[PDB]
Amino acid sequence: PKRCSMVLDVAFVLEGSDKIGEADFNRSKEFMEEVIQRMDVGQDSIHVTVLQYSYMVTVEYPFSEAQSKGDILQRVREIRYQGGNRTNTGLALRYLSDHSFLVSQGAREQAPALVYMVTGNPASDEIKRLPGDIQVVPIGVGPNANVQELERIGWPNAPILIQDFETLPREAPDLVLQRCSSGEGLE
């Protein structure tokens, strides 16, 4: 099984809108749980922050809190589907650059920054250019993803396109960990 063991600050950003729905959001959670389980999460290795967004953005787990796999996974289990009426992807991205990845919020100065963002709908809001240092790998799930929007957000990273949320926990973890370890997408 593909492994990722390195000094890395990883963010998971999950769309939890009404358009996603509780059932598909739970599949996104299960995808995320599987990835964290496979990752070498620890104080001296991979660190994890988790965000959920729709109408607003919730920091479900900051970098500043205990970086053990057990503490992260248990908070993840506690995460509740918000079900908002918007897909404010631009706001979620602003959180990453202006809050999540700050040293004052637990991020490591020497660690590279990597974001896996699971979304199934076009952004409701304006998306602004992220600082190049924050690498975003968009995971566009389902027929309603705005692929060109995700390509622009992602560059240099190709979006990972998944047919549906049922396939997400089955297919995506392998691809996510390959990207984690190598630093680049496939082919």
Ligand code: NA
């Ligand atoms: Na960082």
